[PDB]
Amino acid sequence: QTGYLTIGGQRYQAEINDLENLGEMGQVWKMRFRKTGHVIAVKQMRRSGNKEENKRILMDLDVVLKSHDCPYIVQCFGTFITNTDVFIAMELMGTCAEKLKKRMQGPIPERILGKMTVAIVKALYYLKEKHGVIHRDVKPSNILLDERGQIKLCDFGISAGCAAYMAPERIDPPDYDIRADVWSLGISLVELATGQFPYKNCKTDFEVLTKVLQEEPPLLPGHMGFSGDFQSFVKDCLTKDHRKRPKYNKLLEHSFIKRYETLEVDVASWFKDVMAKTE
Numbered sequence: 001q002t003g004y005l006t007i008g009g010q011r012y013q014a015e016i017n018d019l020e021n022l023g024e025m026g027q028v029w030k031m032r033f034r035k036t037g038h039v040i041a042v043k044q045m046r047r048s049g050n051k052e053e054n055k056r057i058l059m060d061l062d063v064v065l066k067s068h069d070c071p072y073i074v075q076c077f078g079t080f081i082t083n084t085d086v087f088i089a090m091e092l093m094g095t096c097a098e099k100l101k102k103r104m105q106g107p108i109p110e111r112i113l114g115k116m117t118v119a120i121v122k123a124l125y126y127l128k129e130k131h132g133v134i135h136r137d138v139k140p141s142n143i144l145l146d147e148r149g150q151i152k153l154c155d156f157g158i159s160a161g162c163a164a165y166m167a168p169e170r171i172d173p174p175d176y177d178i179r180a181d182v183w184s185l186g187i188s189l190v191e192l193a194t195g196q197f198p199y200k201n202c203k204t205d206f207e208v209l210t211k212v213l214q215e216e217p218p219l220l221p222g223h224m225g226f227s228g229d230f231q232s233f234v235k236d237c238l239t240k241d242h243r244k245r246p247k248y249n250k251l252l253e254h255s256f257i258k259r260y261e262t263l264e265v266d267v268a269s270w271f272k273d274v275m276a277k278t279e
């Protein structure tokens with residue numbers, strides 16, 4: 001089913017000419033539907049593009065299309081197949097978690113990372129159970145937010161990943177990366193909660209790999225007033241031995257995860273305030 005946009009619950013029989021280009025962002029464009037007025041995200045894939053690049057653009061689209069019942073993954077409205085290109089209509093979000101770290105110029109409050117952690121873990125657990133896919137590249141770049149308070153995962157073309165957020169067993173595998181995304185989430189949490197990257201002063205990709213193995217996991221400092229439930233979640237995610245790393249089924253029952261499921265925090269109001277101070 002191509003040539004149909006499904007924003008909300010309305011199916012629109014439209015073409016690529018019914019979308020106005022509003023400029024490059026993030027080849028993903030910010031485009032505007034002229035028939036209705038919606039502003040959406042359109043990823044353009046050139047047929048004459050790279051085979052390795054395009055093969056990733058169809059892998060994430062394959063699982064994004066089958067992740068329609070997951071509210072923690074960016075949803076694809078439709079697709080436009082012309083004789084030259086392929087246009088993937090993704091929903092429009094505010095920005096990513098990596099860009100939020102630069103706009104903040106400092107740490108992100110724990111209450112925001114709580115709803116973020118609940119959203120990301122459910123996304124990975126949904127991928128491991130419903131479709132049996134692992135992300136293999138979890139980092140702040142793939143954590144999107146919007147002015148409505150929603151937090152979702154973003155395209156996983158490799159479902160090796162980024163060498164900085166690598167898990168210890170994905171570097172020295174004893175012979176399996178079933179729970180290696182748990183470590184990647186932990187490294188991303190320490191980076192956003194402190195503002196600094198945990199493995200600092202590393203000029204080569206091999207240096208972080210040594211510090212991941214040769215040095216104790218980088219935990220959260222105690223003089224920043226972080227919650228006890230939040231510090232134990234980072235310690236469990238950053239367990240060095242892969243065999244003692246908790247599964248996703250045990251993470252959903254953690255005291256920190258269940259704390260921010262029932263608690264309703266205003267991510268929408270906090271997101272509009274930080275993005276207001278632009279450069």
Ligand SMILES: *CCC(=O)Nc1cc(C(=O)NCc2cn([C@@H]3CCCC[C@H]3OC)nn2)cc(-c2[nH]nc3ccccc23)c1
Pocket residue numbers: 025026028030039041074090091092093094095096097098099140141142144147154155
């Ligand atoms: C980490 C890199 C990244 O996430 N880049 C990225 C940037 C944007 C972006 O800059 N969007 C700008 C934008 C924001 N708005 C809102 C909502 C519509 C009305 C105007 C604003 O509200 C006042 N409009 N444009 C966006 C994305 C992004 N968004 N959805 C994506 C899906 C898949 C990939 C990237 C997406 C990413």
